[model samples]
Target: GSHMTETVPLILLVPKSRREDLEKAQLAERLRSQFFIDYGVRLPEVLLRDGEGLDDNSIVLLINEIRVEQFTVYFDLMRVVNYSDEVVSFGINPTIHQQGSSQYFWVTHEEGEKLRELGYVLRNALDELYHCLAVTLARNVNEYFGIQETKHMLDQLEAKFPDLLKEVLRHATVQRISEVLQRLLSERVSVRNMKLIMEALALWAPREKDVINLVEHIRGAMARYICHKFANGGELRAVMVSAEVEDVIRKGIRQTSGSTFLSLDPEASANLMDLITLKLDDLLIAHKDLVLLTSVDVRRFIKKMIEGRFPDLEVLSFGEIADSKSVNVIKTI
Candidate 1:
């Protein structure tokens, strides 16, 4: 005969007085049968013992030893059944008694029924753990890859518009130059009114070539007029012979008489022409390389240069220079 060593018991014991109501051996047999049926492995026998206490609601079932391997297999089976619809098999060895040969007995229907109830609880717990892990992994992946995506977009933009990038770089350089000019002109005494300075610059800009030519024609006419005036005056041939006086009269005729139509003294006219030439030269240098000028840039360049040179001019107005409202006045014919 095989000796059944008691392990963790499935049956509860009752007092001798209640023995008639409680069938301990039958319950243990039922549990053993169920374990084999559900997990396909025989569990160690459970022995119900007499507990010496009147206050005990149920008698204790003492396990002499537990089969750790058998418990692990049972736990795995229960987890698979409840959490996943996956069927798996556990190859637990049949119990071996010291006195006899090992015998394998399949678990009965009653044991399988009891384990089915416990499977539901295990299934819920496993599901929650899996869900938590999935959510955490999703969040980490999104955050890590988001930055890489932005860097990729910037690389694509640089490759597509290289020329636009160069223009932006040039614009930045011009801005740096303007900053230096602002600092240099901050305390200059001759700085003109910003409005007038801008007007003058606009008047002289290369874009206004027609206006410049017109002014030049007027000055040239004045020069010729002054030369004739002196020749006809019958002033000493000695006075006309002096190169200094000749140059002065020529300059006076070009500046004051050109636009005002009044002959200025030779010396004063020469001084005026010098001032106008200096302003025109500055305008040319600043905008020589710029292919086209926006109205805003035109205004800014004029204002800055005027402030740099003629800081004290009171009625410097840009209205006459910028004729935005003129309709059909000039075309690029």
Candidate 2:
């Protein structure tokens, strides 16, 4: 009953009849494959239990014995159809989904494949389940990563760039490098370019050992990758923070020996939040993603200020964008 090392479990509680189908679907394997591709971290093992003691047609996700979310599934061979602009219309018995907002419906797999041909994004029960779990892991990325997981990458890099790897370790501990990577992961930033990141660290770690500073430099160094990842085509669509708001944030920033933090009063912070919310609503409708372009001095500070409310928002510094890409400011606030 006891183990030498502790592990965090991602448990999926599913109906007894669904267990065989779930195994056949290979949701865990698919998630693991894409997790590394998207997040640059290997997904740990997943546990699936026959929910004999719970719902018969529901799939529940548990993170460390705590129920995090539940998704309804139809084990009767139903499929989900995601409505898109390309697919103008649909036919055949379609029941609108209860909670889905994208005009999706529950349809037969026969119709599912037909709709797939018609340009609608279709997913089976297992596909929906996999998407939910993948999103949760992405949202809480930093929680599942640490120095232990990072050491694997370091070992791989040591073989290729022994001197560069040692130079990073000379100034920053593996734990510090882990922190830089963790912070990057927290914001859904890719650490796929390990060589570029290590090169940045070798150059900057000696000059600035602060994790935040190091992360900022690393982000700047990885501008091409970041831009390519987020930008649509060669154009980056984003909302710009007004000069006045940037100035206010610049004024609110306070620095100590250890780190930098924002010191805006509650009233001032509330006002900024209101403006940000209003602008973000428009940005989401316009581009479907929230990108806040601000000056470098206040980018991180403003990011800290609104992150509690707008965790999905990506706050980018001016310097973090490459020169080749064009910025299209949808709205400035």
Candidate 3:
């Protein structure tokens, strides 16, 4: 038998009843265009079709030939996603789907108005699907992003800084450079400023060859952009990790080959999460969003610990955003 050649990286399965819907068909294309718009990187197209063993209200998403558990929706209910600060509160009780790290709440149209009036972001069923697709693409960018795109960025730099581009490659291989970019995207950092990113890498690559270390420095270089992305009305609202918590986390950090990760036991980790959650709820309800600020040494560890439950929350190092004059510390955890 011959092998099939299908280059699509995503496959979406919709119910039979809505299978023929043109909107469903175009959803995939829209995801590709929207991804390019948001991250300045193009994604491979998605395949959409009717599922054989699916309920009428079910939607299934598969990426890289692997399927995530199916999610359901009701025609009368809209979803309130926690992606932006525009939504202050999601109300007393709503059906929440913790699809991966993102939080999707289901609420009725009547209830939608109440929250919408309160600045909540509402989306229809299709919009929710589109959003989930977007999130999955964003989180897994490294899988889809490749050498071609990396080389493309280098090509763009050749016109203005040919020697600089050469210097970057001389210090790091193309794959290593791509890994650095992948790490940035992993934390939702934009690589739109290819010149600055490459320049920073070139400056530090000779001395600091570790990808994670390089990314941290690159993030420091991108401090302004990172702050601008999460700041509310020009004020950086944040929850600071106190010296106690930082020390606890710092003590548990164990270094392995090619990586650094927190090694806190489950008991300590749970206690840390409990304490952080207690303050985080108040901060979220009052400010609608926040960034976690701590010393650079522990920033990555803290992020790795809490990112699963609070994917939208950004963990920033004090060194990275210290330059911003307008700072509002909501609380310390």
Candidate 4:
């Protein structure tokens, strides 16, 4: 116990029957697998106990009795989450679970196969849920001093637009700007360049009042910084849109005073979808980030058409790719 220096193991306070049922469902194994995937740094040595004395009085364990030091609530909270994950994972299994042995088995029968697939789908969702929670927790820890970053960003932003803040903008306008910044931060965009975002806003605000259009202008401003994210080492391998394909989509754009939209006439839309699907299929199999490089004029049009269908596709214009970088045109569609 002297050499031990780890957070206290969490004890699940449930009925004896409940604990045994969770074990039979293999929930503990699922928790261990997901926890390892979520936070890769820690070793899972904590005894996942079901409340009460852990074991033998002969080998008594004590926190203070051992030379172990105190651990933070945050550290122990992570341990609690691992325990919570075990309990929570089996939540969806009961929805479509089979009961009888031969009649309700998860394989070798029609009902069994469906039940098996349902269970698998539910487990995959839990994996995603836990990963999202891990992201929120990381974000929370960074804000533990309680919104100092928020105030600092607002101050910087207001100071950046002194003339506008004094004469044109009011308190509500500045607060709305802060909300926009927080919204971007919530979606995991880097507000590390608040000055650039403010600069983009200053230019776009007079012309476009819509928040989405304004935010996109900021995204365009940050494109060079965003471009490096797609790179592996110093190079980026991407799928290319051929001139013929780009030309077809560019013809579809309908720019208006209010907005611009893509309207690929029916037969052309089907053909365009099929060709892009065929080209993307190989890279999807190749199991890497999918980047579509196209002309600046047609980039937004191409994305508007294909992005809804292929959510994983990253559409970038030639302008978005920095001149210094190396790009391998893995395919042309």
The lDDT of each candidate is 0.28, 0.71, 0.71, 0.47
The lowest-lDDT stretch of 10 consecutive residues in candidate 3 is: 1-10
Best by TM-score: 3
* Model 3: per-residue Cα lDDT over 1-333, one tens digit each: 001113645778877787677364576678777767656677776777788888776787777678854767554588764333334453356755553333456777888888777666667876656645555566777667766677777787788899989999999998888788778776667777788888888888988877777888889988876666556345677778899999999999888777777788899899988887776663322222457899999998888888766665678998888667678686788
lDDT of 4 by residue, 132-165 (tens): 3333322322222124344555565567766644
TM-score of every model? 0.17, 0.74, 0.74, 0.48
lDDT of 1 by residue, 44-111 (tens): 55455444563323334323322211101111122212211121233222221110111112222343
- Give lDDT tens digits, candidate 2, residues 218-308: 8888887777766635467677889988988888888899777789899988998887777655222222143788888887788788767
List of clashing residue pairs for candidate 2: none
lDDT of 2: 0.71
Candidate 2 lDDT at 221 equals 86
lDDT for 297 in candidate 4 is 77
lDDT of 2 at 11: 80
**Candidate closer to the true structure by lDDT (higher is better), 2 or 4:** 2
Which whole-number lDDT from 0 to 100 does residue 263 have in model 3?
A: 88
